[PDB]
C-alpha cells in the first residue's frame, strides 16, 4: 500500500492541467505530442469509467484503486501487512508493548506481562524497544 | 560463518583506482557474531556478496 | 545501442550496452491486465526515463516522436569520447601553453 | 602523516571515545549497507573496533 | 547485578492503556499460531 508513494511524481507529471485532477485539454496535448490518436468518445468513457466521481476530475484514489487491482500481491505479504496494520493502533508502521498487550486482549490472546515484554524483546534484535516489519516477519518465519 | 573452513583464493584482485577498503578478519567476525547471535542470524540473510 | 571498446595495445577487451523505454510511444501491448486503460497507464508510468528531461518539452508540442529519437540517441552517440582511454590506466592530462613548473 | 601517530592517538584515547572515534570512521559503511541498518550499538561498537 | 533486569510500567503509559480501553479473530490463525508457538517456548 504505502509503496505506491513513488507513483506521485507520474501524478503530477500526467496532471498537466495543475488543478490537482485530469483534463481533457491535457489529454489530448500529451496525445498528441505522442502521436496516437484514439477516439474523443473513447478517451472520455475512460475518464468515466476510472473517476470515482466521474465528472471529467480525475482523482488519485480512481488510479490507486487501478494499480491495487492489477498488484494482486501475494498472500503471505497482504496477511502480514494487514496484521500489522490492525496491531500497530495508530498505523503509523511502530509496534509497542501497549499496543501489542491491547490487540492481545481484544483478540482474546491474551498473555501475562512478562510473556507481552519477553515477545517484545524476542523481536527487538536492535535493542531501542520497537519492533519493525522485518522483524515481525522473522517472528512470523516459525 | 557458514564454510568455517579458510580456503585458497583462486584469482586475483587488482586496483585501478586510488581506492578505500574497510577490512574485516575472519576470527574476530565470527566471535562478535556468536556473540550476538540475535544480530547474526539477520546478518547471514541480509548479507550477500558481490564476488 | 551496443559499443565494444578497443585497448591500449589494439585490442578489443569489452562490450558496452545501453537500454531504454520507449513504451509509452510503441503500439499498446498486453498479455494480462486488469484494465487496457490502466495498462496503458502503467506502462506510461513506467516510461518516466523517457518522460523525464530528455522529452519534457514533448507536452507543448505535437508529433514529437520526429526529433525524440534523435533526442535520446544523441546522449548515447556522446559515449564515443568515453571511449576513449582504451582500458588504460594513466595520468591525467593538462592544458598546453602552460608549461610543469618542475 | 608526517608527525600524526594515529595509533598512539586511539590508545591515549579511552575506550568509549575509542568506540566513538571508530563508529564516525566506518560510520560511511555502516549507513549505506543495509546489513548494518538493524545492528545494535553493543555490536556496531565491536565491529567498530574490529574494523 | 548486570546479568538480572526489572520489568516496570510508565504512568503515562498505563493512563494511554486505560483510556484505550475506555474507547474500544477468526481470520488470525496465523497470529495464533505464532501465539500457540510463544507459549509453547515459554512452557
Known amino acids: 500500500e504505502e509503496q505506491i508513494a513513488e507513483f506521485k511524481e507520474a501524478f503530477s507529471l500526467f496532471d498537466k492541467d495543475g488543478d490537482g485532477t485530469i483534463t481533457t485539454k491535457e489529454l489530448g496535448t500529451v496525445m498528441r505530442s505522442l502521436g496516437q490518436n484514439p477516439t474523443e468518445a473513447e478517451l472520455q468513457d475512460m475518464i468515466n469509467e476510472v473517476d470515482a466521481d466521474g465528472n471529467g476530475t480525475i482523482d488519485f484514489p480512481e488510479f490507486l484503486t487501478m494499480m491495487a487491482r492489477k498488484m494482486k500481491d501475494t498472500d503471505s505479504e497482504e496477511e502480514i501487512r494487514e496484521a500489522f496494520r490492525v496491531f500497530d493502533k495508530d498505523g503509523n508502521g511502530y509496534i509497542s508493548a501497549a499496543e501489542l498487550r491491547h490487540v492481545m486482549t481484544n483478540l482474546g490472546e491474551k498473555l501475562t506481562d512478562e510473556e507481552v515484554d519477553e515477545m517484545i524483546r524476542e523481536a527487538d534484535i536492535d535493542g531501542d524497544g520497537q519492533v519493525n516489519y522485518e522483524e515481525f516477519v522473522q517472528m512470523m518465519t516459525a | 560463518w557458514k564454510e568455517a573452513t579458510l580456503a585458497q583464493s583462486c584469482a586475483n584482485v587488482r586496483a585501478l583506482t586510488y581506492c578505500d577498503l574497510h577490512v574485516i578478519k575472519r576470527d574476530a567476525l565470527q566471535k562478535v557474531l556468536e556473540f550476538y547471535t540475535a544480530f547474526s542470524h539477520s546478518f547471514s540473510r541480509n548479507l550477500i556478496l558481490t564476488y | 545501442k551496443i559499443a565494444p571498446i578497443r585497448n591500449e595495445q589494439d585490442k578489443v577487451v569489452l562490450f558496452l550496452c545501453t537500454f531504454s523505454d520507449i513504451t509509452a510511444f510503441k503500439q499498446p501491448i498486453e498479455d494480462d491486465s486488469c484494465k487496457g486503460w490502466g495498462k496503458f497507464a502503467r506502462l506510461t508510468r513506467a516510461l518516466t526515463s523517457s518522460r523525464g528531461v530528455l522529452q519534457q518539452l514533448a507536452p507543448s508540442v505535437q508529433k514529437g516522436e520526429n526529433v525524440h529519437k534523435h533526442s535520446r540517441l544523441a546522449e548515447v552517440l556522446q559515449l564515443g569520447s568515453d571511449i576513449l582511454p582504451q582500458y588504460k590506466q594513466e595520468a591525467p592530462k593538462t592544458p598546453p601553453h602552460i608549461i610543469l613548473h618542475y | 602523516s608526517r608527525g600524526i601517530d594515529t595509533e598512539k592517538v586511539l590508545q591515549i584515547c579511552p575506550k568509549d571515545m575509542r568506540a566513538d572515534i571508530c563508529v564516525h570512521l566506518n560510520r560511511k559503511v555502516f549507513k549505506e549497507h543495509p546489513a548494518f541498518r538493524l545492528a545494535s550499538d553493543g555490536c556496531l561498537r565491536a565491529l567498530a573496533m574490529e574494523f | ?43
Do not use: G
Open chain 5, 1 to 43: 547485578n548486570l546479568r538480572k533486569r526489572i520489568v516496570f510500567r510508565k504512568i503515562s503509559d498505563v493512563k494511554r492503556e486505560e483510556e484505550e480501553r475506555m474507547k474500544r479473530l477468526p481470520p488470525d490463525h496465523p497470529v495464533r499460531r505464532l501465539f500457540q508457538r510463544f507459549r509453547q517456548q515459554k512452557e
